[PDB]
């Protein structure tokens, strides 16, 4: 009781939810568009000053503690990878931070990075569209192909949000909350936190065997980011060859994901359907 009632590490957990999961909703949307214009639009994505300023400004409107515990120290690739390289940190009480480990901070940062990459691909698909792809017969075929790709990508993005939340965040987050609710002793809390981190990483396909489907999905996401960038640059950077390459990437990703998750089968059925 003496160690727990004062330090309010539940506030640290809430900040992890709000930043490592981008739960500051309206401000989160504003920061998502700003981050798209920063990293995706070739702004100061790796600049510590610019990234920190953007993060603090978007995270200071109503709940500044998100900007306090999370500052966007940017630094330094695939379309998903070029946006990476930043650094960050957090604040927590001590000697509560004595039991607290930087490994859990790194795991939360990895979850935040996965969410940020998903949101960056989502914003790239948001800016891109059939209209963007043809912005800069063959015209009808390009419009139809872009429409099919956009419909597939939109369904995939909505499913990613909801289902990934359920698998890695909703179910795993609820389990972590329940475990922390049970955890009140230093050793028990450390064990509960480690178990919660492992459960959250379980839906992250961190296992070596689970990394094959993760790599297929990552290749699909990188190809999607490149294709969305080419569509945003229109037909000038969009070629019938490039469109065929994107369609082949989508189809091969679907087939390989179906095979991998069948060899887990729910993702296999989804990929075969896609």
């Amino acid at each position: 009781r003496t160690l727990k009632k004062d330090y309010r590490l539940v506030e640290y957990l809430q900040a992890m939810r709000n930043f490592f999961l981008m739960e500051g909703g309206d401000t989160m949307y504003d920061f998502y568009t700003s981050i798209f214009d920063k990293i995706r639009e070739k702004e100061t994505w790796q600049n510590v000053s610019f990234l920190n300023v953007q993060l603090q400004e978007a995270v200071g409107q109503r709940y500044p503690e998100d900007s306090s515990r999370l500052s966007i120290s940017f630094e330094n690739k695939l379309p998903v990878h070029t946006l990476d390289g930043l650094t960050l940190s957090y604040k927590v009480p001590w000697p509560v931070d004595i039991v607290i480990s930087l490994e859990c901070q790194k795991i939360y940062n990895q979850v935040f990075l996965l969410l940020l990459q998903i949101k960056w691909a989502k914003y790239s698909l948001d800016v891109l569209l059939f209209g963007e792809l043809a912005s800069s017969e063959p015209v009808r075929q390009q419009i139809h192909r872009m429409f099919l790709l956009r419909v597939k990508l939109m369904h995939f993005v909505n499913s990613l949000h909801n289902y990934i939340m359920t698998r890695i965040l909703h179910s795993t987050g609820l389990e972590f909350q329940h475990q922390v609710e049970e955890a009140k002793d230093l050793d028990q809390l450390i064990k509960i936190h480690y178990r919660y981190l492992s459960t959250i990483h379980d839906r992250c396909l961190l296992r070596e065997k689970v990394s094959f489907v993760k790599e297929a999905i990552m290749k699909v996401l990188n190809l999607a980011l490149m294709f969305a960038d080419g569509w945003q640059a229109g037909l000038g950077a969009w070629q019938m060859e490039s469109i065929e390459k994107m369609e082949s990437d989508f189809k091969n990703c679907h087939m390989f994901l179906v095979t991998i998750l069948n060899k887990l089968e729910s993702l296999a059925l989804s990929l075969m359907a896609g």
Binding site: V48, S49, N52, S73, E75, T87, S89
Partner: protein, 428 residues
């Protein structure tokens, strides 16, 4: 009793004293030290903890709070009783603690836990009494304004008045007589600065470490010195080297502003040269003065708005929030550290570059004002060299601003740079 106990026997332990995150923290520490800590320093406290003569039951945390409280009693008797105020032992709290201490020393076991609990109660009572006394009698808002106007040399109307009147001893050679006459000149300037309340101005005066007074320079501004009066016990609270650092920052800012004012005189001489067409050496002087004026305008605007106005408003509001004299001092020192980082006086090469920029502005000033009319052979050479110096100082300043932004945060610097970068031809 007064923080007062004869340590001559030293029977107690009371000493009568006299990697991105890590790299960023270390660089910030070095630059902040070399900028803010360059001239500010306090005097060693008259009390300390001679823990070599401490008992085993000297509880480390209770002893830290006890050093704070004993030095608080000493501070009461030496600042709150420095000259006019009165810092007793604990006043009536001393009698209450006397009864409690009779009970405690009656108790055989030296239980530092409950003893430290009562001691911390007394310490919090002392802190509350000190906070009330500070809120009542401290009233250092006027002292802060005086520090800005003189210690920071930031009273703009009185500064212009002094330039018109009190520069007769700053621009004059440094002599003790000129130093003392600067006091009268500054009083006259304040009297003509829309100010007629020379009470602290009567407290204000001038006594420079002049060429004849530093040892017994060639400019009274070079070997300069003012004479203002502080109020007790805030005189003790004002670390003498802290006021020295205020004066040093004011002197650096005044060197920059004197280069700026001389350049203003030079460009106003070119505008009074508007009696015929400007020449080509005169065009060199006009271009030098215009580049210097633009750079000085951007730098002065950024510094005043943020390095000065932002820091000043932040310090004022934070001191208004910090109801504890220590917390208000913390707000003032936060503003001081912010101003030191804005000064960028950390590196000796940085100070040399700032002096070079100020001297280039002053050289453009001399070239344009002296050649307000035609630029003679000397006038043309001075105008061309001044234009080159202003351009080189601007280029080196853009490079230094980029480097400083890369090292640490620079908001006012970035705003000023982008303001100049509305075209960025000279910035780039």
């Amino acid at each position: 009793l007064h923080g007062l106990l004869l340590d001559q026997h030293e029977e107690f332990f009371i000493k009568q004293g006299p990697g991105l995150t890590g790299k960023q923290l270390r660089e910030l520490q070095d630059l902040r030290l070399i900028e803010e800590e360059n001239m500010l320093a306090p005097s060693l406290k008259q009390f300390s903890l001679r823990v070599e003569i401490l008992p085993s039951y000297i509880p480390v945390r209770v002893a830290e709070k006890i050093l704070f409280v004993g030095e608080s009693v000493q501070m009461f008797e030496n600042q709150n009783v420095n000259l006019t105020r009165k810092g007793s032992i604990l006043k009536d709290q001393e009698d209450t603690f006397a009864a409690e201490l009779h009970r405690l020393k009656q108790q055989p076991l030296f239980s530092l836990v409950d003893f430290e609990q009562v001691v911390d109660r007394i310490r919090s009572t002392v802190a509350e009494h000190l906070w009330k006394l500070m809120v009542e009698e401290s009233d250092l808002l006027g002292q802060l304004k005086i520090i800005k106007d003189f210690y920071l040399l930031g009273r703009g109307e009185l500064f212009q008045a002094f330039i018109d009147t009190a520069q007769h001893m700053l621009k004059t050679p440094p002599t003790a007589v000129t130093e003392h006459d600067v006091n009268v000149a500054f009083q006259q300037s304040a009297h003509k600065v829309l100010l007629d309340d020379d009470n602290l101005l009567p407290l204000l005066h001038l006594t420079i470490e002049y060429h004849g007074k530093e040892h017994k320079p060639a400019s009274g501004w070079a070997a300069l010195g003012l004479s203002y009066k502080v109020q007790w016990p805030l005189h003790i609270l004002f670390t003498p080297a802290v006021l020295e650092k205020y004066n040093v920052v004011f002197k650096y800012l005044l060197s920059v502003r004197r280069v700026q004012a001389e350049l203003q005189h030079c460009w106003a001489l070119q505008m009074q040269r508007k009696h015929l067409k400007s020449n080509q050496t005169d065009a060199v002087k006009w271009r030098l003065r215009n580049h210097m004026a633009f750079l000085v305008d951007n730098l002065q605007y950024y510094l005043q708005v943020d390095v000065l106005e932002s820091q000043f408003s932040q310090l004022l509001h934070q001191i208004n929030s910090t109801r504890d004299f220590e917390s208000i001092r913390l707000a003032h020192d936060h503003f001081l550290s912010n101003l030191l980082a804005q000064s960028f006086i950390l590196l000796k090469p940085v100070f040399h570059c700032l002096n070079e920029i100020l001297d280039l502005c002053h050289s453009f000033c001399s070239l344009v004002s002296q050649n307000l009319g035609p630029l003679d052979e000397r006038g043309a050479a001075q105008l061309s060299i001044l234009v080159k110096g202003f351009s080189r100082q601007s280029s080196l300043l853009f490079k230094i601003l980029s480097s400083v932004r890369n090292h640490q945060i620079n908001s006012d610097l970035a705003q000023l740079l982008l303001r100049l970068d509305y075209n960025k031809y000279y910035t780039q």
